[PDB]
Design a protein around this nucleic acid. Sequence first.
RNA 1: AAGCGUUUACUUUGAAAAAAUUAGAGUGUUCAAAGCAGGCCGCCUGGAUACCGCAGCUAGGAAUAAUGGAAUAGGACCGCG
RNA 2: UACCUGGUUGAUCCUGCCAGUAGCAUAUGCUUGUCUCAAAGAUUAAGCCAUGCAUGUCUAAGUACGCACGGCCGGUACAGUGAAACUGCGAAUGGCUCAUUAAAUCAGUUAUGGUUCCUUUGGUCGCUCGUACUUGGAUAACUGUGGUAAUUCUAGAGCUAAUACAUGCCGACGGGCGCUGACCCCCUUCGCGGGGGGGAUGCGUGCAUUUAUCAGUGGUGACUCUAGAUAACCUCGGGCCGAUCGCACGCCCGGCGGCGACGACCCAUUCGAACGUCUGCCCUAUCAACUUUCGAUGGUAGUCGCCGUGCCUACCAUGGUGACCACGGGUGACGGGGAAUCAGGGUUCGAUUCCGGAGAGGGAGCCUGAGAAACGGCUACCACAUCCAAGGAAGGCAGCAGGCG
RNA 3: AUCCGUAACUUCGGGAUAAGGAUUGGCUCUAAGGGCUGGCAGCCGACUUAGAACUGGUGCGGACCAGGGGAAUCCGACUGU
Lengths: 206, 262, 177, 143
Amino acid sequence: GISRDNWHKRRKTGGKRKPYHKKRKYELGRPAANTKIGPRRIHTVRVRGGNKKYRALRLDVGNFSWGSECCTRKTRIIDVVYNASNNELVRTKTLVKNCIVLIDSTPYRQWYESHYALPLGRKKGAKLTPEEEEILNKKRSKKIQKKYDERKKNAKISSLLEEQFQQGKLLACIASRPGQCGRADGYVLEGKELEFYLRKIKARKG
Amino acid sequence: ARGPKKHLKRVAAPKHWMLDKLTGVFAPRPSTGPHKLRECLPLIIFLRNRLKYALTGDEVKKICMQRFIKIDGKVRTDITYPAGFMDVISIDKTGENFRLIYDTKGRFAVHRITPEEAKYKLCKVRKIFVGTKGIPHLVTHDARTIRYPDPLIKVNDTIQIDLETGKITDFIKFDTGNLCMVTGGANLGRIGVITNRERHPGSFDVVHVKDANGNSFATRLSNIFVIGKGNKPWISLPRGKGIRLTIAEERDKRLAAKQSSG
Amino acid sequence: FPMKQGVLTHGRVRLLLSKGHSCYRPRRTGERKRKSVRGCIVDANLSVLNLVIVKKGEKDIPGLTDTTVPRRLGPKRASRIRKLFNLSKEDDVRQYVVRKPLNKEGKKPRTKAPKIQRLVTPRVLQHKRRRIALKKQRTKKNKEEAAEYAKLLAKRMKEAKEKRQEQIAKRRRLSSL
Amino acid sequence: DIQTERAYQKQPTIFQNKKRVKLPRYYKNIGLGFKTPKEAIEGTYIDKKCPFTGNVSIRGRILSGVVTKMKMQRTIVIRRDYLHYIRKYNRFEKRHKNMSVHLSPCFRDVQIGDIVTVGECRPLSKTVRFNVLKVTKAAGTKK
RNA sequence: AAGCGUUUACUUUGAAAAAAUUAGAGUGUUCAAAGCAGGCCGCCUGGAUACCGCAGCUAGGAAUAAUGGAAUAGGACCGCG
RNA sequence: UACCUGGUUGAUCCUGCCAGUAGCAUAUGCUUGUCUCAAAGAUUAAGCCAUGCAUGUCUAAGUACGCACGGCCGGUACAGUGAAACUGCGAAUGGCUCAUUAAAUCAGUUAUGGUUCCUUUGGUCGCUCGUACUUGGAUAACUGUGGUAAUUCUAGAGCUAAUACAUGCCGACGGGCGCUGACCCCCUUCGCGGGGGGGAUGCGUGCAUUUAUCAGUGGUGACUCUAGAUAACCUCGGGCCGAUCGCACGCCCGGCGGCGACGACCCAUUCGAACGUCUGCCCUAUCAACUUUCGAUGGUAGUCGCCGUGCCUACCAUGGUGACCACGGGUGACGGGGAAUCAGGGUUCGAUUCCGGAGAGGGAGCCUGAGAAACGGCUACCACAUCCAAGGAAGGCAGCAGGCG
RNA sequence: AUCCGUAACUUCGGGAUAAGGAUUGGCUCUAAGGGCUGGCAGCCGACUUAGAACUGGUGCGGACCAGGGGAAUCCGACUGU
Ligand SMILES: [Mg+2]
Ligand SMILES: [Mg+2]
Ligand SMILES: [Mg+2]
Ligand SMILES: [Mg+2]
Ligand SMILES: [Mg+2]
Ligand SMILES: [Mg+2]
Ligand SMILES: [Mg+2]
Ligand SMILES: [Mg+2]
Ligand SMILES: [Mg+2]
Ligand SMILES: [Mg+2]
Ligand SMILES: [Mg+2]
Ligand SMILES: [Mg+2]
Ligand SMILES: [Mg+2]
Ligand SMILES: [Mg+2]
Ligand SMILES: [Mg+2]
Ligand SMILES: [Mg+2]
Ligand SMILES: [Mg+2]
Ligand SMILES: [Mg+2]
Ligand SMILES: [Mg+2]
Ligand SMILES: [Mg+2]
Ligand SMILES: [Mg+2]
């Protein structure tokens, strides 16, 4: 098949290596996974040593970490915006490692409303009619209102992150190798990372 | 080759087994186990070629399948079981306990011990591993994974295990002045006190060991095994006592004893 | 050449066949081999058709429905014997197992019974007690060795604290000197 | 300065987006008595193939050569000289082997003809299996 | 006792160096080529050792051949603000 | 044993080659009484093969309703051998040959802190908090209808088991650990305030994988090492947490008991395998420049791989080797330990029983399996070749003997 | 038209578009090649070049435009008349 080998190509000086053996089973490559966004389709592949590798082919959710507070959530991936390797992987939505994806901000919003009891996103004018978030924000005890007030001192959020929570989509970088283990885990971008990737997205848009 | 090797040639056999050339093309390939290929000596060679109890390998198979041979506290029914250094082979009907100690040469020696000595043995640890819940582990030379050890036991130390329970009793720490069995190389079989330790970053460390008769020699630590504190061992010693006197002195001790015997 | 289910032709088709496929027996473990079969659509290009009567009609054919052929073997699994004889979970299977008579010339008439598989015996009950007794022994070994290492580590910590106090006292002696 | 590529160039070890009320730089000791430079700690560059601030370990051999080419980026070509002995003609001969060695950007004052110390590591590319550990400057050339 | 004291080439020791082969210890295969056996009224023993180019590691030496120091003094040293 | 002689001339002294002289192989001729060892289709054809054999295997301990034998103590299943067959393991070892191959293989030295690893051995295997006195239905061997000219070709109908394929719980297990925290209690203050406790309900709470954050039990010359704390994920083409088997047979007032064998997540050990670091290979210049967007030399980010790597992909830089012989070509070259001749130096050979590599007519691709790009495994094309009813089937002796050339 | 490749011979300029191959349509994108004002920001104007995907009955310089080629012999060098 498609072999991974050092003998099939030239030397350092420029001469050709002549074949002293044929292709082996350890000198083996396989076709690419190239997983998409959709309903989950993971195929197992037996590899060297009797082990398994999980080829993802369509994959929608991923366990994304918000590193400033150390709180990861399983979140649906809806769009791929930036990829440093190939812009064809941006055009055809393909998840590899170090992709920039857009994800739903609702689990991090629910965690922030449960922990710091402050509004997040929430364009001014709207109120919740099922009233459940209002119940979760209100109804505090006297001694635990002190604890939420001490949490409120360290509840400062960045402006670009706050605008992304207001829009509803967060930028996340893929950290796990998706065609190998089958998961599409990663981390939400913050700070200079977020400024760099938003500058690259703005330069691509124009 | 397309996989692992299963045969062993008689020419490709190691020299300390002292197998002869004319009888067979193949050598008994040892099975996998607690010891390496060229460090152990198989049960078929220990039973047939050294003790001369059995004539053929079929007779060796009959002896090991009557459940007579008891290697270090468990009956092994394989003729090619790797019996390496500090292994205790027990035979119940003859009442014979044997401890596989090297001779003064490179070969192993037929070394008779008491049952009180056969109840325990000594093993050098190789590394300390931290298990899945913060549990210290010793890795010995014969692959014995003993957990919850004494934290003073370090990388290059030896432990006096018990055969009936598989636990440690005492330990020798690798210090200067202690005894030294040399387990491998050109000085295989030497016994002497440790006089110097030379550390090396990257390259492997070396130890200068002084013999009881004053023959100092350097040896890398990978083939070094301490057997006790000071000049007092914790095991029994074969004749020769790990000296390696010169070939002229060996000729003298042969010829004078032969002329005295007559 | 035999036919094959699910090929959707009427001619002859050569196919790779492996373990778990029709019209092929694997000789080596995982052996694949080309075999030549026919399409499943029934046409005049056939020697044999196999027919299985599902519903019995009005008339009685003397070749098939008249000659009644019994089972060759009887149920061996105890759960299948319970399903056959409508048995409960506590009643006996040993009395209601089906045994076969054997008779021929020269030999005496015999009656041979099958070995009932998956029957709850005191040997299986002893093994079931045995592995949980081994679980008990492992947990007791863990508790005793953990307590022994706790006492040993407490002793090592006390001696290390004594050594640290001796070192700090030596530092105080050097500072006073 | 830095981060002139497509992806965000960063050190994978340290986390740099923590809650505030200078980036914490990761470095390590290399071993074998080699002193780490001051610029590898002070500066704001990164390099994943640096033996001080990267994911590579020095193992086995520690060799030396002389620098003859600095046209490649983040790596240099060195030249080793040795005298091979033929047993028939009891003489020597000059043979050279020019290996490609990854040059970490902590060593900035690097010219040609400098006696450089290299160390064996994992293969970072097709021909590079060596990192630069310390750079001795050539004889003279103090200006 | 541990660590650092221009770098080598050169010389010596030690380790690591598969066995089979070469030199060679012992041994009446009736001798020898061979083999690792064998010998005594159960015991006594041997199955060594030398060499293994070249390259790599290590510790002594600094005679010989390279290699630099300080010369717009961006030099060491003992101290200071 | 560091060795010479004849031949140019009418005769002499030199250079100079030829011829003798003596070994090791290869063949051949003549002759041959004894005995111990002993190479042996390598040189040309890694050319083609008739025939027969070379990898199969059962223990008290995975399945026994084939009377194929066989015991009488039976009715509380199976006494005991055992054809065949399912399941597991081996078949990736050994043997043959040197075709290809010139920093390649291979030899010495190294590391995997850059990776896998069946078996064996030593560790783990009630750590998880939510019908078990044992769950489901197919199937081979057995019976019965056959198709073809023909295969180690197989189908349909009946049946019947698993340590084959799946599902899945009782127990440990009564309580702890982090968070939610209704609410309650105590002191002080005019009072908001401030300090210290207890606490219903619910959520998660074992090892393995993945991702992110914090601190720094045991180590290394050196980790982004092992371990610890938090947050979650958890692949339906699902990571383990026994729905196994055999021998002696006891104790307690139905429940507890041994010696083992077998099945496996993970960590070591062993057998290894594979990539790498440095050094080393015959002749040729009538081979002086070679490689290079069809990877050539590096960087960044990925795919894939067991892992490190232009191995591959996208974008960049124009780099890399060479008169110290690169590149190209030839080899009547597998490399080495080694063999012969030998003063001291060398020269020639090494296909050949030991180690490593490559291959099964020539390439290419894949299933199974820990391990193969395996050929006494398949799948296609080319060369060679068998039977045929002309629709079709079957092959790989550079294995052991042997046949042709 | 674009990308390869191009021999004998020679006056070294040529032969040469030698010879011999591949691609060409539509649609939807990506990248690269710039000015004015106050390594950065804002505002604007141009045609090209390269690459990818999808798709049509393999059809695509779809009409038009638009070299058949190679090896030799004789004569005249040639451009020209
Ligand atoms: Mg083989
Ligand atoms: Mg010489
Ligand atoms: Mg040798
Ligand atoms: Mg003349
Ligand atoms: Mg004459
Ligand atoms: Mg001659
Ligand atoms: Mg006679
Ligand atoms: Mg005779
Ligand atoms: Mg031949
Ligand atoms: Mg040949
Ligand atoms: Mg050739
Ligand atoms: Mg050849
Ligand atoms: Mg050879
Ligand atoms: Mg092969
Ligand atoms: Mg052939
Ligand atoms: Mg093959
Ligand atoms: Mg064959
Ligand atoms: Mg074979
Ligand atoms: Mg022409
Ligand atoms: Mg003419
Ligand atoms: Mg004219």
